[PDB]
Amino acid sequence: DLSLSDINSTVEVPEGHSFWKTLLAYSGPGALVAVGYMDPGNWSTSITGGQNFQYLLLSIIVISSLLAMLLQNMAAKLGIVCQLDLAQAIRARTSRRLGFIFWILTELAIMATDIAEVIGAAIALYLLFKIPIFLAVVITVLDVFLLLLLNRIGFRKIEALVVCLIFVILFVFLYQIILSQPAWHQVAKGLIPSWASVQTSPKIGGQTPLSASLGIIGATIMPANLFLHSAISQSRKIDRTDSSKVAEAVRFSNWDSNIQLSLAMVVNALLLIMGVAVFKSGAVQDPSFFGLYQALSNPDMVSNPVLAEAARSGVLSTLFAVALLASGQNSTITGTITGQVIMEGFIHLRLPLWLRRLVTRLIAIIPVVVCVAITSHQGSLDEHQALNNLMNNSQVFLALALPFSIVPLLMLTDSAAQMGNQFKNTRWVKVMGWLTVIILTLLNLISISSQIAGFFGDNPSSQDLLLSQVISIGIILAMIGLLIWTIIDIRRFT
């Protein structure tokens, strides 16, 4: 009846004021959440953002990360104080049909992330081991056994294995930056919140600073990782009777989460400066993983003789594909954990980790093998580009499931009927939190129409455009109705 019954309140190791060892104990949840923010689903969009705007967008990254650190922390609080996840809170404060709508929506979000991870991992196999594109996918389907071995390890070593992947993809991209020797002064100048990123005048590669910036801000959080954080934050036993120990617990999970999401921010920065210093200006014409592989393997694309010799040897591209693999392993862990959370929390369905990863991976790979089937039927022409367009079109479910995850979180944590007058949010995080939630909801409701119109490709059929407008209006209005309904129920609780 409690979230993550297998590992809930497992190891509590606060030992007086020995703070840093205590920090070493529970440092896992923050890493498990942060590794999701390093998925390849936006890698290109960083590199592109670097080529179109050298170091300019870095600040935006920071801001985004900060916002992601805010809401995530809030989720952790809801897990630490209430001893229950966000899905159990929402489902407890609303009917079953709304918990079922939220269930299918979040299932579609983690399914989209899973599509990104299976595409990036399969392509990673096509690049490293030269496995055929169709075989690499059905090889990625075999991650259920890696989940079986994953199940016997334990969170003290699982949550450190996630750290291992994090520093794998962090040192892979940091190594290619170390060889690049970039002008770190311009990097520092880019990290400052300037007003050149909010303008619309450069328009390089069909992208203005305000468009790229608002895109980075819009994709700030992932809805599944909020439920994830609220569930894994409970894995540390708390008496819930000593205010100093629960306040300490909040400081604990906060410093952990910021320590890891800061690493994710560093990875995004390494991708932007990867697009600025490593690649030449405008050398990246194919945002696909294969386009970045050959672009990292062509000496004329880099801007340094050392990177030309190393690229001719073929080490940059291979490291890139290794990073693709290490990123593609995340959805096997966090996808199953979060899927269990939303499942047994929203619809009260107890399912094992076997059929979970089976069903999610199959539903994820169906459109992938359909895309590879059509493109390989066209002669393997534009197959990687179509895989990239599938990966980017999948991300609409995140925008569909975002407000129903950030609004109920902010409401339930701001109310004293869930946190109490002692552990509710400060008047500071009330303003910052409501501002961020409004901005993200507006931006994603804007993104719905753009992605739905993007489903029809770059060929604008005049009759299909109006249909995309009708479908977009219907979807955003339906999300408005669901949003005001959830607002009404939660505010009836408070």
Residue numbers in the entry: 13 to 506
What text appears in the publication on this structure?
conserved and function as secondary active transporters. transport proteins that include the amino acid transporter LeuT18.
mutants of Glu129 and reduced to half in H236A. different role in proton-coupled metal ion transport. residual H+ transport that may have escaped our detection.
